Design a protein around this motif. Sequence first.
Motif, PDB file in Angstrom:
ATOM      1  N   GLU B   1      15.315  -5.785   3.501  1.00 22.16           N
ATOM      2  CA  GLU B   1      16.210  -4.478   2.948  1.00 22.16           C
ATOM      3  C   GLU B   1      15.620  -3.429   3.579  1.00 22.16           C
ATOM      4  OE1 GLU B   1      16.895  -6.738  -0.439  1.00 22.16           O
ATOM      5  OE2 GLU B   1      17.895  -7.071   1.512  1.00 22.16           O
ATOM      6  N   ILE B   2      14.278  -2.773   3.115  1.00 15.53           N
ATOM      7  CA  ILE B   2      13.867  -1.899   3.761  1.00 15.53           C
ATOM      8  C   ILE B   2      12.730  -2.358   5.045  1.00 15.53           C
ATOM      9  CG2 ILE B   2      11.760  -2.134   1.904  1.00 15.53           C
ATOM     10  CD1 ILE B   2      11.706   1.117   1.688  1.00 15.53           C
ATOM     11  N   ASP B   3      12.467  -3.499   4.961  1.00 11.97           N
ATOM     12  CA  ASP B   3      11.822  -4.149   5.742  1.00 11.97           C
ATOM     13  C   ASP B   3      12.333  -4.262   7.107  1.00 11.97           C
ATOM     14  OD1 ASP B   3      10.202  -5.291   3.476  1.00 11.97           O
ATOM     15  OD2 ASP B   3      12.043  -6.282   3.013  1.00 11.97           O
ATOM     16  N   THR B   4      13.725  -4.141   7.039  1.00 13.02           N
ATOM     17  CA  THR B   4      14.465  -4.044   8.347  1.00 13.02           C
ATOM     18  C   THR B   4      14.411  -2.664   8.926  1.00 13.02           C
ATOM     19  OG1 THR B   4      16.041  -5.626   7.339  1.00 13.02           O
ATOM     20  CG2 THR B   4      16.657  -4.267   9.492  1.00 13.02           C
ATOM     21  N   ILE B   5      14.521  -1.658   8.046  1.00 17.52           N
ATOM     22  CA  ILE B   5      14.313  -0.303   8.513  1.00 17.52           C
ATOM     23  C   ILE B   5      13.174   0.440   8.992  1.00 17.52           C
ATOM     24  CG2 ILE B   5      15.010   2.195   7.964  1.00 17.52           C
ATOM     25  CD1 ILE B   5      16.789   0.801   5.645  1.00 17.52           C
ATOM     26  N   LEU B   6      11.964  -0.205   8.459  1.00 17.69           N
ATOM     27  CA  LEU B   6      10.836   0.261   8.799  1.00 17.69           C
ATOM     28  C   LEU B   6      10.766  -0.305  10.241  1.00 17.69           C
ATOM     29  CD1 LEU B   6       8.239  -0.768   5.889  1.00 17.69           C
ATOM     30  CD2 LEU B   6       9.013   1.638   6.914  1.00 17.69           C
ATOM     31  N   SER B   7      11.225  -1.787  10.603  1.00 16.66           N
ATOM     32  CA  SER B   7      11.332  -2.411  11.778  1.00 16.66           C
ATOM     33  C   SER B   7      12.118  -1.569  12.696  1.00 16.66           C
ATOM     34  CB  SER B   7      11.494  -3.748  11.821  1.00 16.66           C
ATOM     35  OG  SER B   7      10.655  -4.424  10.996  1.00 16.66           O
ATOM     36  N   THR B   8      13.278  -1.225  12.503  1.00 17.24           N
ATOM     37  CA  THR B   8      13.817  -0.430  13.726  1.00 17.24           C
ATOM     38  C   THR B   8      13.071   0.896  14.120  1.00 17.24           C
ATOM     39  OG1 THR B   8      15.536   0.481  11.912  1.00 17.24           O
ATOM     40  CG2 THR B   8      16.414  -1.325  13.346  1.00 17.24           C
ATOM     41  N   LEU B   9      12.799   1.789  13.069  1.00 17.91           N
ATOM     42  CA  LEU B   9      11.898   2.947  13.420  1.00 17.91           C
ATOM     43  C   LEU B   9      10.715   2.624  14.285  1.00 17.91           C
ATOM     44  CD1 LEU B   9      11.750   4.431   9.796  1.00 17.91           C
ATOM     45  CD2 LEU B   9      13.068   5.485  11.645  1.00 17.91           C
ATOM     46  N   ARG B  10      10.024   1.601  14.163  1.00 14.63           N
ATOM     47  CA  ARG B  10       9.120   1.172  14.721  1.00 14.63           C
ATOM     48  C   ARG B  10       9.329   1.111  16.418  1.00 14.63           C
ATOM     49  NH1 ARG B  10       6.106  -4.197  12.051  1.00 14.63           N
ATOM     50  NH2 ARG B  10       6.726  -2.652  10.417  1.00 14.63           N
ATOM     51  N   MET B  11      10.216  -0.022  16.591  1.00 13.23           N
ATOM     52  CA  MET B  11      10.928   0.035  17.979  1.00 13.23           C
ATOM     53  C   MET B  11      11.062   1.364  18.657  1.00 13.23           C
ATOM     54  SD  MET B  11      14.472  -1.926  19.480  1.00 13.23           S
ATOM     55  CE  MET B  11      15.226  -0.345  18.684  1.00 13.23           C
ATOM     56  N   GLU B  12      11.614   2.185  17.986  1.00 15.48           N
ATOM     57  CA  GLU B  12      12.010   3.402  18.694  1.00 15.48           C
ATOM     58  C   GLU B  12      10.913   4.265  18.807  1.00 15.48           C
ATOM     59  OE1 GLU B  12      14.967   7.689  18.230  1.00 15.48           O
ATOM     60  OE2 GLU B  12      14.972   5.953  16.614  1.00 15.48           O
ATOM     61  N   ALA B  13      10.035   4.403  17.989  1.00 14.65           N
ATOM     62  CA  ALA B  13       8.498   5.086  17.969  1.00 14.65           C
ATOM     63  C   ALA B  13       7.741   4.656  19.211  1.00 14.65           C
ATOM     64  CB  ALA B  13       7.766   4.894  16.816  1.00 14.65           C
ATOM     65  N   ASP B  14       6.994   5.764  19.548  1.00 15.21           N
ATOM     66  CA  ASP B  14       5.762   5.497  20.540  1.00 15.21           C
ATOM     67  C   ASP B  14       4.992   4.653  20.276  1.00 15.21           C
ATOM     68  OD1 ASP B  14       6.478   8.527  19.952  1.00 15.21           O
ATOM     69  OD2 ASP B  14       5.816   8.559  22.181  1.00 15.21           O
ATOM     70  N   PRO B  15       4.267   3.818  21.207  1.00 12.20           N
ATOM     71  CA  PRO B  15       3.083   2.737  20.944  1.00 12.20           C
ATOM     72  C   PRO B  15       1.888   3.505  20.574  1.00 12.20           C
ATOM     73  CG  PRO B  15       3.156   3.062  23.244  1.00 12.20           C
ATOM     74  CD  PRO B  15       4.591   3.800  22.806  1.00 12.20           C
ATOM     75  N   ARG B  53       9.104  10.800  11.471  1.00 17.15           N
ATOM     76  CA  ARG B  53       8.774  11.134  10.186  1.00 17.15           C
ATOM     77  C   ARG B  53       9.655  11.393   9.018  1.00 17.15           C
ATOM     78  NH1 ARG B  53       4.466  16.521   8.431  1.00 17.15           N
ATOM     79  NH2 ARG B  53       3.965  15.201   6.614  1.00 17.15           N
ATOM     80  N   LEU B  54      10.540  12.386   9.172  1.00 20.40           N
ATOM     81  CA  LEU B  54      11.525  12.836   8.342  1.00 20.40           C
ATOM     82  C   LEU B  54      12.368  11.391   7.734  1.00 20.40           C
ATOM     83  CD1 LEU B  54      12.943  14.796   6.467  1.00 20.40           C
ATOM     84  CD2 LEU B  54      14.415  15.397   8.259  1.00 20.40           C
ATOM     85  N   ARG B  55      13.002  10.806   8.792  1.00 22.42           N
ATOM     86  CA  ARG B  55      13.658   9.369   8.543  1.00 22.42           C
ATOM     87  C   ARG B  55      12.858   8.277   7.655  1.00 22.42           C
ATOM     88  NH1 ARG B  55      16.140   8.236  14.234  1.00 22.42           N
ATOM     89  NH2 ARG B  55      14.215   9.539  14.786  1.00 22.42           N
ATOM     90  N   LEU B  56      11.698   8.190   8.061  1.00 23.38           N
ATOM     91  CA  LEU B  56      10.794   7.309   7.483  1.00 23.38           C
ATOM     92  C   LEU B  56      10.745   7.650   5.958  1.00 23.38           C
ATOM     93  CD1 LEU B  56       8.651   4.927   7.909  1.00 23.38           C
ATOM     94  CD2 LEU B  56       6.874   6.741   8.212  1.00 23.38           C
TER      95      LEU B  56
END
Lengths: 293, 388, 203
Positions: B1-15, B53-56
């Motif tokens: 559920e949220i497990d997926t959305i954290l994962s898409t932000l992560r991919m987009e984020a800087d390393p 940040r704001l999205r998260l």
Amino acid sequence: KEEGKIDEAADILCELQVETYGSMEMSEKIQFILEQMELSILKGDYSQATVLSRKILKKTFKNPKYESLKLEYYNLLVKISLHKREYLEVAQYLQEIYQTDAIKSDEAKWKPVLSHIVYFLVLSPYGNLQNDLIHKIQNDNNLKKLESQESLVKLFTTNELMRWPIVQKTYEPVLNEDDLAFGGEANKHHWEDLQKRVIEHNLRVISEYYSRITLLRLNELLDLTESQTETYISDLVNQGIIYAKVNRPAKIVNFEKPKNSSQLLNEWSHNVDELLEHIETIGHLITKEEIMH
Amino acid sequence: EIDTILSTLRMEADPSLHPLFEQFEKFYEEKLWFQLSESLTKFFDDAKSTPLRLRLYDNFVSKFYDKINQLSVVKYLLASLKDSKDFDESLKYLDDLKAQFQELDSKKQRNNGSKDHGDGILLIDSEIARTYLLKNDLVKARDLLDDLEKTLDKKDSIPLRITNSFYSTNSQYFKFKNDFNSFYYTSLLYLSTLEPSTSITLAERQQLAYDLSISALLGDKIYNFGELLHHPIMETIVNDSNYDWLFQLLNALTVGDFDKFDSLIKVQISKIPILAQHESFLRQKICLMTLIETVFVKNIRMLSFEDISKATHLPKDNVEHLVMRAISLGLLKGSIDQVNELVTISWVQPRIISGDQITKMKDRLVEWNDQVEKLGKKMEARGQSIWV
Amino acid sequence: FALPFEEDEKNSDVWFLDHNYIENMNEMCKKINAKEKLIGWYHSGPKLRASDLKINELFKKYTQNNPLLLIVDVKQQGVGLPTDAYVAIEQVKDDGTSTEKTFLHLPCTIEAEEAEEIGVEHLLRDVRDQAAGGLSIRLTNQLKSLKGLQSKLKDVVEYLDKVINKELPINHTILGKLQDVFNLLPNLGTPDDDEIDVENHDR
């Protein structure tokens, strides 16, 4: 009115209402008497106008059916004491106009009124009346929207030194665009009047801070010569706003009313009681800090 | 559920923000949501103005409101909307989140029965006032600021965090009208009660350091100059070019060297026009400081106009004009004698006390101590017999 | 009235207060006179402690005022009254440190019932030498006041000494009154201090 017979119309209509009243409504009665006052400004008897104004009670204005009439009436009383050049009376009348509900709530209508109270209050003779009223003006948040006006009052409310060709230069291209107290051939004599009040304002500041100043130095301050300086001090002691004694050899002009022995000594007791209190309170806060450290 | 959305932000984020992102997944699952609060703080410090940040926070805000601390959730949002440059965005977001909170507390406050949510209302509300000060609405902000203040007072204890937010709305309002003195006083209140926690950057501190110094130089009664040098803000910001000559002015004012101040200000007045439009004041300011300060360090309380003339480097005319301003300002009260060429000072204003001043006063107590002891020796000896 | 209270002296950070008793006890106070409510607590002295800061929390859920701290010194030491009185305040500190909770001094004075006042005098049989009567009495009080001044003033000099050689923290608030001692201070040879002589010649 259209005729050259306008003065003759002042005579007929003023006499008539002393014989005529009847059962007419309060709004009609008020309207004739204000018209008559307007014809007596034109006749050139403002004093006659005053007597007709005291016929209708001011208590009759307090209801809102006569709300417009109240506005014109005060404004006529402004013109009438203006003509005799009493600026304390003119200052008070525009304040009546301000508290009236039409002026106060409509954004536009209060503006020229607030500007005029302020110009006239400064032109007033320094009374006990002028004091209470000038610092009422500051309490209001209306005043802060205006900026030329805010700054004009802001000098006089605090105590400071200033000079007349500073006031003169600064406020001339500004407030010669607005009428009442400026321009004209008789309102330049109402402008002229602010030279004395600027001089009077200095005399009050100097009174509080110096108690002995040289009369030769006082002349330089005010930008006046020795004769003129004398006349300003005389008239200001007379009203009861300052107190002084001038020494003609030119050594000292001394501003102070000399203090009794009892007065100086009563203040010396007050210091001693307060010194004993200070040592106490310190002593209790020293005990506190010994635990903290 | 949220497990997926954290994962898409992560991919987009800087390393850069990757190892921090991971911790949100782990902790949520294990349901160890105190280590969750720590991870969010850590994350937010170095990613304040990133758009992740704001999205998260949006994800997290909807899920918990009372399964992590009320104080913790709202302060995240405040730092966000400071950094949000769309101010419209800010006003809307705030109103919806506050409403939620208001409805939430009817049921939650009693069920948990140990947790309050009405502390959150205030934390938000302070930011609503700030947001209007961004869209340049002074009226709207003022109305909220009188209300914030009365609420503050009603409680019998305040958190640090609430009163911080309160001094922040205040500060931004006063500096728009461009009122110096009013600003300075407020800022002192804000600085002291501040959190240890960094959610305030170096940039902010340094900006406040630059404003507070402008305020003190261009002021008319701030002789709390020494307080900036004995308070971390200005003491440790000295190292940039700007804050060498600025620091020095303040050091100059205290010791009263007129040459040093004068010389430095000529160079700098061109570069910065805020000093340039208040110049009359700036130049007189150091003269006011030396005038009050001579009286203090003397035992007696009267000065010749000759002494004053030397000390400020002014003629005798302008010595008198300077005392008259000073009194008008309310630094000094007394009398002016032009015919004895004295100023007889009757009260001096209090001021802060440093080491030097401590000893000055100490010494004067020594004489008066002796006077009490020996006057008391004379009284012992007369009517030694009568003391019944 | 007493409350059951225990204080541990080995470690000062542990104490006993019974919350149940206080409510019961207050109810019985209403029997006596129902114009009484909890407005604070007495401490047995001999001085202020900083463990009193923690005790204080508990009595905020009883009172309608900021709670009262009264040191009743049981050994009766002090040159005036043997009570200091304080009240708990929360405030920001301007010496650049956070919000403290602190006990700020409130002056102590007495007023009493009319009835109580005839009893106090009734037990007592001293002639007093710390209150004023006759000429001789007022000479004794004259000397006592001067020696009182000597004692407190001495303490100020040594307090100043501590900050710059032992390092007590500067506190601007305390030293600020001591500046005002100087500005309100009398002067010699002014036309005020010559009125002072002329008044002596009159009397």
